[model samples]
Target: ISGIRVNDNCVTEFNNMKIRKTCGWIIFVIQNCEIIIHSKGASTTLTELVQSIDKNNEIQCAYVVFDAVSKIHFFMYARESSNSRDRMTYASSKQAILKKIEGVNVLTSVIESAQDVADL
Candidate 1:
């Protein structure tokens, strides 16, 4: 929905309000069966993560979800700057790196229910 270059395997069409994508850093979700929602704006990943802490950068929040088990992470950059007006400014630079992980949310509704309802 935004002007960002998404990798072909970056997203999976699930519903009108939700989509799935590979966390890239990990392979927790089943192939082509995960849910990831990214903001429709500018987002960047300074470096790739491998088995490390899952993180996000504002516009690049990723989730590894499948069946009823899931994990998510949100990462962004933060910095203290002395701008003329604003006491602090988060310059859009690679210097600042911030990351956060979220508790996994498991859903009881399984794909079998979806298929029963013609969602397949």
Candidate 2:
């Protein structure tokens, strides 16, 4: 009862208080934008949660921590080709397909597993 608790699909209990679910990512378009979120990890205490400002809570933040983590970095570059088809390859490393085709590089970060999620 003292540890983290998953109350339901969209609710979680921490420090005997209810912590509402929040979005983890965002997407924007010209002249408009769309915001979406999922409930897969909404009730879990692990993973990163987006920050949301509510009347009940004036501030918010996303604190993600993991154990035995290894981060990988990658670089992207376009290769020239005679044909119309786009062909690319790396010298010694493998190419990583990013979520967006226009992305050129990728980076990662890690936090200590003992980090705190919230303060109440």
Candidate 3:
């Protein structure tokens, strides 16, 4: 564990994203080594979100509602170019967020590239 923590706002947002029909995305970033909500907006398109990705350096948590089902999926966007500490930070923090949401239909993916975002 890297001692990373998720903000309370993110928990509520993840809950809302699951409960509401519109919200399909939630993005988190490491701000000062603490996991914090970056952007979690209701969307019909994921393209704009992909455009915002740093491609390298930034560490993010991008969650999606399974297109095939209503299940929630959290994608760890820990870009390979990011710091090793940042990588481990997200590894543990991902579970922390998953646990806070108390999900039974929830799942996770460790995304390796920009295309993986589209692939998932």
Candidate 4:
């Protein structure tokens, strides 16, 4: 356990608290826009996630969905800070997400498969 730490008591307490507070919370992987978990009651959505992400406006962010043609990317411009590590980033709109799927170009075989869904 040199690099591993396990505290059942603390872990259980933390998990319980997290579950209680985020019973309906949505989970989002910044690398992908795909909805890992749907919200039930106190869940979070893309909008809320975006707001929270941009709140710090320091880390670079991007998200893509499965079978999606486009990805959402965001970058924050940093003013002169004490550290030189702060700088600019990239960003995209949710509309890009929709546009991606709409503009997708499928191969002939895939197109044929999509059209043959009735057979399946």
Q: Going through the candidates in order, what is the number of backbone clashes in each?
A: 3, 0, 0, 6
Q: What is the C-alpha RMSD, rounded to one decimal, of candidate 3? A: 3.4
lDDT of 2 by residue, 27-82 (tens): 11111111111212332222233222111121111112111113212222221221
Candidate 4 residue lDDT tens string, 33-79: 23121111242343444344345434233222121114222212222
Q: lDDT score, residue 46, model 4?
A: 33
Tens-digit lDDT track of model 1 for 1-118 = 2122323333332221132333322221211322223323211331223112123322112332222213333222121222332211211210111111213332322211112223
The C-alpha RMSD in Å for every predicted model, in order, reads 16.5, 19.5, 3.4, 16.2
Backbone clash total for model 2 is: 0
| Candidates sorted by TM-score, best first | 3, 4, 1, 2
Tell me how far the alpha carbon of residue 73 in candidate 2 is from the true structure, in angstroms, after superposition: 17
TM-score of 4: 0.21
Highest-scoring model, lDDT: 3
Estimate the lDDT of model 1. 0.24
| Comparing 1 and 4 on TM-score, the stronger one | 4
lDDT winner between 1 and 2, please give it: 1
**Which parts of model 4 are misplaced by more than 4 Å?**
1-42, 64-120
Preferred candidate (TM-score higher): 3 or 4: 3
Q: List the residue pairs that clash in candidate 1.
A: 56-74, 56-75, 57-75
Shift in Å, residue 100, candidate 2: 5.5
- Measured against the true structure, the TM-scores of the candidates, in listed sequence, are 0.18, 0.15, 0.70, 0.21
